[PDB]
């Protein structure tokens, strides 16, 4: 946060005088919302997963829409999974409230790992929304003759008192009670400040009882405060994101041959093929791309545990032998390059289990 001085020297035509004020402001040059991408690859469909999160311990934010716009480079991928919030969704710095925004992308011809996608998430801080709530609900409830009187000091109200308030965000997160912290603002001097200003008596009175009431902790949670964000401008955080760079893409499929008692061979045949043509990059059927079935403590592999991929499509048999009692996952697999390169693996049935039923 930094300070800024603006100074104007504007002139009018009806009068001869040269007017112009000189204001000093404090600007918050910090990004409240934080985003972290996480992607999943599967055969011919691509998945994004953005874990949207706040970036400050005591400044939770609220979300409205997070539609991911496709790039304008061409009639490209058809995106599917845009999110429009019926009501604002609250997110805090960290906890068991992981906000996930997921997208499913299907290509028309092929993928290219040089395009740029734009997220375009719209949001607001909870402080701003609740400030609108207090200044529209607890103070000007269904009144016009009073609001026209109060309009004189609206800019003061929204700048010297409303901005200085501190809201019990923990209390709101727990019980949705709109209460201030103990060391939020000292009314004994705030009343003196307003008294020092030329102010109408009833306006002073209503501001005083408003501050006292909200210090007492009014706790309207969901019956209201969902029709007041209409007049609140949203912030927007269009952020770019790109697919990760990699050299080759493989997918491995275990096919059953011809439930399964312990200590008995299960005949499986693995099918490994370099499906890199789908993603633009041409196949490399001679690279040092050793493929190995990681032997765990619950699966004994019989056959070719490891072999070097030097063909577009490779297939070979393998017999699995379980060790533990029941409901075991398939053995993990990995394709790693020998020199320095990286590649992405699509285990077709990573999360699938066999029920071993002994004897």
């Amino acid at each position: 946060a930094f300070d800024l001085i603006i100074k104007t020297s504007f002139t009018k035509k009806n009068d001869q005088g040269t007017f112009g004020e000189t204001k000093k402001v404090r600007i918050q040059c910090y990004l409240q919302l934080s985003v972290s991408v996480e992607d999943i690859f599967k055969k011919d469909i691509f998945f994004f997963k953005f874990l949207l999160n706040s970036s400050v311990r005591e400044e939770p934010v609220i979300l409205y829409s997070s539609e991911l716009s496709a790039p304008d480079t061409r009639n490209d991928y058809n995106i599917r999974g845009d999110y429009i919030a019926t009501t604002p969704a609250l997110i805090t710095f960290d906890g068991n409230e992981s906000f996930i925004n997921c997208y499913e992308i299907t290509a028309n011809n092929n993928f290219d790992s040089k395009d740029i996608f734009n997220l375009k998430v719209r949001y607001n801080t909870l402080k701003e929304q609740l400030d609108c709530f207090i200044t529209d609900a607890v103070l000007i409830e269904g009144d016009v003759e009073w609001f026209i009187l109060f309009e004189k000091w609206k800019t003061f109200w929204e700048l010297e008192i409303l901005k200085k308030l501190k809201y019990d965000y923990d209390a709101f997160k727990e019980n949705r009670i709109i209460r201030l912290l103990k060391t939020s603002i000292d009314l004994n001097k705030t009343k003196s400040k307003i008294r020092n200003l030329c102010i109408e008596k009833a306006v002073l009175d209503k501001i005083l009882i408003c501050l006292n009431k909200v210090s007492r902790g009014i706790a309207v949670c969901n019956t209201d405060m969902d029709e007041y964000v209409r007049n609140l401008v949203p912030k927007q955080l269009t952020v770019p994101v790109q697919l990760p760079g990699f050299e080759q893409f493989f997918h491995v499929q275990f096919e059953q041959m011809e439930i399964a008692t312990i200590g008995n061979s299960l005949s499986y045949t693995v099918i490994v093929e370099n499906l890199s043509g789908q993603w633009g990059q041409d196949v490399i059927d001679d690279g040092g791309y050793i493929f190995e079935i990681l032997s765990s403590n619950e699966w004994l592999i019989h056959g070719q545990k490891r072999c070097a991929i030097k063909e577009k499509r490779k297939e070979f048999e393998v017999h699995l032998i379980p060790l533990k009692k029941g409901y075991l996952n398939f053995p993990r697999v990995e394709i790693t390059n020998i020199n320095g390169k990286s590649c992405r693996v699509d285990h077709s049935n990573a999360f699938e289990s066999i029920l071993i039923f002994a004897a």
């Binding site: 050793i290 019989h302 070719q304 072999c307 029941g326």
Partner: protein, 264 residues
């Protein structure tokens, strides 16, 4: 010696055997020697090992006998650089360690003219619950068919063997508890625990609840003919709830550990 190998045998008390699994792979020496003399001018060369015969032989003194593998192993197999082939052998198991020999006869096939033979070999030794007993007592329990699979909804029967040899007859009473065990952990693990306890509680019912097993005289046996019926599809491995109470010292031994009911 680009045939670095290992033997990582694992015991199996369920079927009463030990599974010895040799796994031989091309070592880093193959990588070092490939680009030195095998094909120096080429950029991506590979070895062409061919295995004439692999033997896993059980030996005791002067006698020896070959052991076949679990699944078939096609003997005249090829092998290239960066390979790992493993074979598994089953031999039945106290304090008498075994003695085994592994011999791999193979040959490199540099060009289809010459073949250098190798006969590397080495000897070594094969070195590294369902039955439930009663604490502070000698009575012992075992299910005749601890591994039962039946269609869900149908009532089934499970035959519980009691061994009594301690001093005197027992008045043990068996029951299944159909109440959710109170939980004691984060929300994730705590809800996992609650779901497990609920599934245990209202999954199976014993149609002879609170059966008074009449008498089990000393140095004799008895068959508690328990009768069940399931109502939730699932795999109830080592099912809890089926706990037998002894009305002599208030033993609450968990007799259900030797049960592996599966119902669709």
């Amino acid at each position: 010696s680009l045939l670095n190998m290992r033997l990582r045998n694992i015991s199996l008390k369920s079927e009463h055997c030990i599974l010895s699994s040799l796994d031989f792979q091309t070592s880093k020496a193959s990588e070092q020697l490939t680009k030195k003399f095998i094909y120096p001018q080429e950029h991506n060369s590979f070895l062409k090992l061919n295995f004439q015969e692999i033997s896993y032989k059980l030996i005791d003194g002067t006698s020896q006998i070959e052991l076949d593998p679990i699944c078939p192993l096609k003997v005249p197999l090829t092998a290239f650089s960066y390979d790992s082939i493993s074979a598994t052998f089953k031999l039945v198991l106290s304090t008498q360690p075994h003695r085994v020999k592994i011999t791999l006869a193979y040959e490199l096939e540099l060009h289809p003219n010459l073949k250098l033979p190798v006969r590397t070999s080495w000897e070594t030794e094969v070195t590294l619950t369902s039955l439930v007993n009663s604490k502070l007592s000698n009575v012992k329990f075992k299910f005749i068919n601890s591994n039962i699979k039946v269609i869900k909804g149908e009532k089934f029967t499970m035959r519980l063997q009691i061994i009594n040899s301690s001093s005197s007859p027992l008045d043990l009473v068996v029951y299944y508890n159909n109440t959710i065990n109170p939980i004691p952990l984060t929300l994730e693990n705590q809800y996992q625990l609650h779901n497990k306890y609920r599934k245990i509680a209202e999954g199976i019912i014993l149609l002879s609840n609170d059966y008074k097993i009449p008498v089990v005289p000393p140095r004799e046996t008895y068959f508690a003919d328990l009768r069940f019926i399931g109502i939730m599809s699932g795999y109830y491995g080592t099912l809890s709830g089926l706990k037998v109470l002894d009305l002599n010292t208030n033993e609450l031994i968990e007799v259900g550990n030797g049960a592996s009911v599966l119902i669709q």
